[PDB]
UniProtKB/TrEMBL annotation, chain E:
GO molecular function terms listed in the Swiss-Prot or TrEMBL record: GTP binding; GTPase activity; metal ion binding; structural constituent of cytoskeleton
InterPro entries: Beta-tubulin_BS (IPR013838), Beta_tubulin (IPR002453), Tub_FtsZ_C (IPR008280), Tubulin (IPR000217), Tubulin/FtsZ-like_C (IPR037103), Tubulin/FtsZ_2-layer-sand-dom (IPR018316), Tubulin/FtsZ_GTPase_sf (IPR036525), Tubulin_C (IPR023123)
Subcellular location: Cytoplasm, Cytoskeleton
Binding site for GDP 1: 10-11, 98, 137, 140-143, 174, 180, 203, 221, 225
Cofactor(s) in the UniProt record: Mg(2+)
Binding of Mg(2+) 2, residues: 176
Species for this entry: Sus scrofa (Pig)
This protein's name: Tubulin beta chain
Binding, Mg(2+) 1: 10, 176
Length: 426, 120, 425, 426, 430
């Protein structure tokens, strides 16, 4: 049995965690009290002597507000109180505060709970980590946690799901700083990180769901659909991406270039005819459906996987794949084969009942490692340079014990990554 | 070109190939950096409480100075009034001494007028 | 990260302090007897931020009322909400401060300050996690100016890691109680540069000018000026007091609004400007960056914004709020620094302020605030180059060079502001 | 708390004190036995166990005559007998008898009584001293006493109320001498001195009050209303209050420049209602000044307006707004704002049988103008005329003085004239 | 505030007795010492001049002194003679032969211890002695010689006390005794040094007033003493009666005597009347003020317009408008500015007492410190020199033990006095 452990750090990670575990319980028929009227779900859910199923999850925040809504909420009975860890005072959007000041005070406790979940595993694969780039806890504590998890579980995979900041979705002035800082610290410790751009998700909610101003519930439910596609491989007895190690093998030919672009289709408004395998497929190469804003035809591909879901027949898939070859000019790097790994997972896509998504008989999620995602880094790098040339806000970080040198070091790493992407797409 | 990969209960996977490739720290290091950051935080805090302490000392020096100013104003007033009061006393006593001596010199003269009357 | 401890010092501090509590007690449904009679539970969600719960489920402001003079706190006690305040949190001396910053800071203030710090130390131990301190006070007089800055210095020594935030009223010859206001204001601006994290600059010059010019009040009174001040203090704290989109406290505000430690003086603004007794979203957005709406008598078009916070209150589409705020930004691009991306932030709250179905409050960190300090500095030099009224300060034990140090530092703050006005990308 | 102790020296001081304490007892409802049917009057009256309210005042004279009228008059049971102190022989219009020969025999008695009044204080604000420039006692004994109070009490506020001589009102030939001598020795010791030109009071009585030949009771009752205004701030609760410290710091810009010009309005004959604007304007018309001089040719360094009665601050504001426009009224360059305002609620009380009319509101302005130097100039000239011939000096030398003291006192007055010139420089 | 009154010699006891008669009537005291008066204003300052006897009687604080026993029987004979304490009569048996040296050095010195006994007893009965006043002539031997000796001895014992004299100046019109200029010059010597204020009563002016104005062909001492008594009443009014004035002898001396030697006052009085004579018209206030700076109303034979007033005190008595009184007094000063020194500002003072003297509805007394008084001292000095040039009668004086040199010194000193009066007469404020 191939157990995975989910870690949800800070506000964004806790609220995306809420949305995923909600969908998981709906997908596997687990009620909010953990009762349940294919046994691959046990990779994500343990079982107690009372017959209840408990997520293999830990929720971490340096502030009690968000997790208190888990403690008192609809799924309050699903988690045991040990799995929910709060401090009293948050990181105030300050990476060095979450990483050096408070993080030093709560890390050993968090590792202790992780150590305990890991002891209920006969074959732990590793960790899924959810966090924002922008918050002080999501950037600062997460990067401290990754450092420690590498020390304590060396041969174990870590996959990140990272919220990339956007001015349209409640961002703060200092989030470029936090983003570059945590990316520096966690690069060598993550094996595969799926970035979620809040602007991309917000755009998708507006255009396809007709919600002029999406809520966090809106964005997180749409995010969970994407996360669900990626983990459905692990939670059901699928054939593509059956273990955490397979993501590196299939999507990350070069270690630092481990940031794949997810694409999902279709997103149909519940308020508002079933789409073929071929229509959801060529809608995988339209930038509007990307989780990160970039132009993949001004880049090159190193890997590409299609995760189908629902009533999808293999001949339809090949029929679609042949059509887009002649219809679309997509470029792979010289040293990679030009083609696709295809997975069908027969479980239908599931939507939260009453939510804003519509139930569909078939859906697809495409995972690609493209050099085009470099321009998301370029955008952050530029906002970092504007503020750092004037040393703006740096004094908050130095006051927590960080050295101004860490800023230029982190920014030099981001430069190296930007030209790593340059070099492989030469 | 299709290539079958795997089949299972809840799915199957394969691969499609169009063109082939054109081309064939430590725990102590971690906690070392965190203890160093913690000792920079505590040193900056030490410096702040040091400057605040320096301001406490200045404040009680100002309060002391106002006390000393008031005591020096009493001490100057006291000795200047004493000098004034004793200077007036020596002057007024001298005027009286002189006035009495002139009257007594006249009394000497009057006894001399009398004795001179006894010669005649 | 929840509770605020509030301190009002001196005549002015206690007047606007009272008017503030009068305003937020009405917003949260707290009556003067201390008990609650509102209709939305949004009024109780963050009530602990500013109030303590009493035994009889009554709410008691987390306020400490300070004066070297007994007169004003008799006046507070007699006001409308005078009974709401904890009788133990009144700390009043007997002598007064004689309109003299040296008396407030050195001699009279030092003999009352530890009685104040006990009441502070007691209210803060009754906190689960203390977010910070907020102080209301004038800089022109002796108690709020001199003892207030003494308080701040001594609170910082006992709570080094806590945010200190002041609402500082700026003297003006248009509404002056005393001839030595420039000395008092200059000596304490020195202190605020050193020891506060956010200061809201309330300019009596601007309040008077709004009442006279916009509100057509021939003869402004402190009641009029304070009507504008309490509206601004309500708006500025709306996100601390009410649940909303924002999960943020005073520390996160300091982080995102203060790019450089000394540059932490904010221009407050408000719209609509109203008179006691007696608008569209586009108009709201526009008059918020209008000189006529700044509570600091500076023309923002004379400088550039480092950062701006705006909050809109009332029922209104956020789509139209954001569209007008971006239009204004892009229309006036040369008044925002380009080396701080997305430096104009907007929050909306459904609950409109009492008496108004819509409003907007503006917090801007602007290089144009240097005009305020230049003004204090020229009045300072006009008196000080003749050593006028100086003997009242040296008599308290102060040295002349404390004065020159204070003006030298304030002239450094001006040039510091000017340096980022001229910075390019 | 906030007690003030009053010292009345010599005939002029004692008789004015009579008028003042009769006025206070009326203003507060204290009958002449100190019984009484807002406790701010306790700054000026202590209370015995039987409910007897007793002035915090000493009356002193080197001759018993004037204080014997007190000891036998209406208010003879208002003061304890130890507060009324008399010697046997006056100072015969000779400063040096008041300061040395006669005064030195009673000075210790006077400080011991004062010390006992101070011992009943828990917040002594300061001393108010009433005396004439011209008397041997008014001049010489007040100088002795001010010196001795500075020794006993350090820098504690000492404020004077000084009667300035006038030929129209029982002046003597040597009064110029006594005026300069007391001004010299008292400069370093007084913090604020309010001069009352007997000619100015005299003229107000004949012009406004239609009294052919005013008597002392006429003059002194007028003076009392002005003193009452200044002290009203201290004995009443009021809307805008001004303690003794606020007086000194808002009116005295340099230690030696401490002689404010007093103005009072309205002064209406009893046998004959004015606006806040009307009375405010009349404080800048020279007919109502307490010293004869012309401020329209001087410069103002500080103005203190004390209103009593039915006065609204908005009306004081509108009225002071008018004054700031009239450039007939010129302030020095270095005074960015020279206005401090008091408002007390209780209208001026009129003594029955007096000549002033009850008014709803009045105002007393204290202004520091360079133009008060004109009054020093008139005394110095009379000093010089006589001193050039050494007329009358032998009376002073006989009591132990030195001519040395005469020129020193006159040179200090030269420097004071030069000080008033220089502070009006732009 | 008690005064001790001493009268010495014939003239001293005659004008002293007249003084007591006049103020006793003003104060309601009859010759027995009982008070028979109408108003208590008579009694308020009665202790200045009278002691309170048991029996509700009042005894003048008076010391009567003469070397000749004669005149002190006629004072006992005089009306009010029984009013004086008998123990205060100190008289010898030999006169002084109109010889100052007998008064000062020989016969007078033997009797002077006994009068100091009385003075010590009267003054230590006082609670606060103001000072002393002495009535005497300067032309005789007892008043001049023994009187100035008494002053010197009282100086020794009471040096902080005021000394005041009413001094009668000789004249050839009145007395024929040729050595009166010698006695007056020796006396003035002493007075310059040892008194604080001296009223100069000139027998020359008293004679001229009686002869020229009162048309008395052959005036007598009684005629002349009427004008003395009126004046002494006038100048003591504000010591004796409560008025505006809160003042004693020392306050008077401080304001009237700007230089120590220049303390000789020129008294004046209006209206002038002869004794026991009904006045058929009281003067008006304009008349009083005018006739008071008129040389005909001076009691010293000097024209005021020949000099300058250093200081002037005017006392008006009667029911009159203080409006009109202060009006005229300013007029007088303005019209006649060139007679007041400009370097003593406000040097004319005016008091009004409602109590008029007996026989007048209104009167005025003038006390002027004028440089014209040098015309008096010159006249004495001229008469002195005309005798001394020839050593006339010197053996009357050296036979008593004096030396010529003492005469030379007194002449020097009086010429010095004339010189200083002229120095200040000629001084400008420039
Ligand atoms: N998609 C999505 N993004 C979120 C959510 N909550 C916060 N974010 C984003 O995360 C960033 C802010 O960081 P937070 O996670 O909220 O901060 P934190 O990790 O709790 O650390 P602190 O600064 O101490 O609060 C912003 O860019 C937000 O837009 C969420 O529920 N869904
Ligand atoms: N306004 C007023 N002035 C007075 C009064 N009494 C005296 N004066 C003035 O004071 C001066 C006289 O000084 P006094 O006070 O009488 O003398 P003294 O202080 O008692 O001292 P002595 O010289 O010892 O009598 C003159 O200018 C008088 O006009 C008074 O009752 N009211
Ligand atoms: N006006 C006035 N002058 C008098 C009177 N009696 C004497 N004189 C004058 O005084 C001078 C003489 O002085 P006396 O008083 O007679 O002499 P004395 O002081 O008593 O000394 P002896 O007579 O020598 O014992 C002469 O000028 C007289 O004219 C008097 O009653 N009235
Ligand atoms: C406690 O109340 C506030 C607290 C903060 C902010 C704020 O303005 C909207 C507040 O209301 C006045 C805030 C301000 C400005 C920012 O940039 C200038 C920013 O990046 C970010 C913020 C806040 N964050 C967001 C997403 O608005 C956190 C700090
Ligand atoms: C006890 O009697 C008198 C005492 C004095 C004065 C006086 O003349 C009016 C007297 O009556 C004769 C007096 C005299 C002269 C002054 O100026 C020449 C003066 O300034 C002042 C005075 C007197 N003072 C006043 C105010 O008149 C004090 C001394
Ligand atoms: N805005 C405003 N300013 C005030 C108020 N009261 C006083 N001031 C200003 O505060 C300064 C005087 O300080 P004040 O508080 O009276 O003296 P303190 O008690 O020693 O602090 C001057 O600038 C006054 O105009 C008020 O109610 N509102
Ligand atoms: Mg958070
Ligand atoms: Mg007196």
């Amino acid at each position: 049995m191939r157990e995975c452990i989910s870690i949800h750090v800070g506000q964004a990670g806790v609220q995306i965690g809420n949305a995923c575990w909600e969908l998981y319980c709906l997908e596997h028929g687990i009620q909010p009290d953990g009762q349940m009227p294919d046994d691959s779900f046990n990779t994500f859910f343990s079982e107690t002597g009372a017959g209840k199923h408990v997520p293999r999850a830990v929720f971490v925040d340096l502030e009690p507000t968000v997790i208190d809504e888990v403690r008192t909420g609809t799924y309050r009975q699903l988690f045991h109180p040990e799995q929910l860890i709060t401090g009293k005072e948050d990181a105030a959007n300050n990476y060095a505060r979450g990483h050096y000041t408070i993080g030093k005070e709560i890390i050993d406790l968090v590792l202790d709970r992780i150590r305990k979940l890991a002891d209920q595993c006969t074959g732990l694969q590793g960790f899924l980590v959810f966090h924002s780039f922008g918050g002080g806890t999501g950037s600062g504590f997460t990067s401290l946690l990754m450092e420690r998890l590498s020390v304590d579980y060396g041969k174990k995979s870590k996959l990140e799901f990272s919220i990339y900041p956007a001015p349209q979705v409640s961002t703060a002035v200092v989030e470029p700083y936090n983003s570059i800082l945590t990316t520096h610290t966690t690069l060598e410790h993550s094996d595969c990180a799926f970035m979620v751009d809040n602007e991309a998700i917000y755009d998708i909610c507006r255009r396809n769901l007709d919600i002029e101003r999406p809520t966090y519930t809106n964005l997180n439910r749409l995010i969970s659909q994407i996360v669900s596609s990626i983990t459905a491989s692990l939670r059901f007895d699928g054939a593509l991406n059956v273990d955490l190690t397979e993501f590196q093998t299939n999507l990350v030919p070069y270690p630092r270039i481990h940031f794949p672009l997810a694409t999902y289709a279709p997103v149909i408004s519940a308020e508002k005819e079933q789409l073929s395998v071929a229509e959801i497929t060529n809608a995988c190469f339209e930038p509007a459906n990307q989780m990160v804003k970039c132009d993949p035809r001004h880049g090159k591909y190193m890997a590409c996987c299609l995760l189908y879901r629902g009533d999808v027949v293999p001949k339809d898939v090949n029929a679609a794949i042949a059509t887009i070859k002649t219809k679309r000019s997509i470029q792979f790097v010289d040293w990679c084969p030009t083609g696709f790994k295809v997975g069908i997972n027969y479980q239908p896509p599931t939507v939260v009942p009453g939510g804003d998504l519509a139930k569909v008989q078939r859906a697809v999620c495409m995972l690609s490692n493209t050099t085009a995602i470099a321009e998301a880094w370029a955008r952050l790098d530029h906002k970092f340079d504007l503020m750092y040339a004037k040393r703006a806000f740096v004094h908050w970080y130095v006051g927590e014990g960080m050295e101004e040198g860490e800023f230029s070091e982190a920014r030099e790493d981001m430069a190296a990554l930007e030209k790593d992407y340059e070099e492989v797409g030469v | 070109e299709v290539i079958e990969l795997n089949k299972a209960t809840s799915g199957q996977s394969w691969e499609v190939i169009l063109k082939p490739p054109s081309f064939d720290p430590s725990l102590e290091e971690i906690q070392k950096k965190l203890e160093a950051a913690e000792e920079r935080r505590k040193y900056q805090e030490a410096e702040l409480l040091k400057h605040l302490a320096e301001k406490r000392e200045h404040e009680r020096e100002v309060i002391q100075k106002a006390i000393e100013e008031n005591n020096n104003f009493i001490k100057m007033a006291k000795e200047k009034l004493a000098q004034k009061m004793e200077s007036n006393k020596e002057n007024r006593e001298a005027h009286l001494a002189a006035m009495l001596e002139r009257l007594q010199e006249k009394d000497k003269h009057a006894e001399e007028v009398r004795k001179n009357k006894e010669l005649k | 990260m929840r509770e605020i401890v509030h301190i009002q010092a001196g005549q002015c501090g206690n007047q606007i302090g009272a008017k503030f509590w009068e305003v937020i007690s009405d917003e949260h449904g707290i009556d003067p007897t201390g008990s609650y009679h509102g209709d939305s539970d949004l009024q109780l969600e963050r009530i602990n931020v500013y109030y303590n719960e009493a035994t009889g489920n009554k709410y008691v402001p987390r306020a400490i009322l300070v004066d070297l003079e007994p007169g004003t706190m008799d006046s507070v006690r007699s006001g409308p909400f005078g009974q709401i305040f904890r009788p133990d949190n009144f700390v009043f001396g007997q002598s007064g401060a004689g309109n003299n910053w040296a008396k407030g800071h050195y001699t009279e203030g030092a003999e009352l300050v530890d009685s104040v710090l006990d009441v502070v130390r007691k209210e803060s131990e009754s906190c689960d996690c203390l977010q910070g301190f907020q102080l209301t006070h004038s800089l022109g007089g002796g108690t709020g100016s001199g003892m207030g800055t003494l308080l701040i210095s001594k609170i910082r020594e006992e709570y080094p890691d806590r945010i200190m935030n002041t609402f500082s009223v700026m003297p003006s010859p248009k509404v002056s109680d005393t001839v030595v206001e420039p000395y008092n204001a200059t000596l304490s601006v020195h202190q605020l540069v050193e020891n506060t994290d956010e200061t809201y600059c309330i300019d009596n010059e601007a309040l008077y000018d709004i009442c006279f010019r916009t509100l057509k009040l021939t003869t402004p009174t402190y009641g009029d000026l304070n009507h504008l001040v309490s509206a601004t203090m309500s708006g500025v704290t709306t996100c601390l007091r009410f649940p909303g989109q924002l999960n943020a406290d005073l520390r996160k505000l300091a982080v995102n609004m203060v790019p450089f430690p000394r540059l932490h003086f904010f221009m407050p603004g408000f719209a609509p400007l109203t008179s006691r007794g007696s608008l569209t979203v586009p108009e709201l957005t526009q008059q918020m960056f209008d000189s006529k709406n700044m509570m600091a008598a500076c023309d923002p078009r004379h400088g550039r914004y480092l950062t701006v916070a705006a909050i809109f209150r009332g029922r209104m589409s956020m789509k139209e709020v954001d569209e007008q705020m971006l239009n204004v930004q892009n229309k006036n691009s040369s008044y925002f620094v380009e080396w701080i991306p997305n430096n104009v932030k907007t929050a909306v709250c459904d609950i409109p302020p009492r008496g108004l179905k819509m409003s907007a409050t503006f917090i801007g960190n602007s290089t144009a605030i240097q005009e305020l300090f230049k003004r204090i500095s020229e009045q300072f030099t006009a008196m000080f180059r003749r050593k006028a009224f100086l003997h009242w300060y040296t008599g308290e034990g102060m040295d002349e060079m404390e004065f020159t140090e204070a003006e030298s530092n304030m002239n450094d703050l001006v040039s510091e502001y000017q340096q980022y006005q001229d910075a390019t990308a």
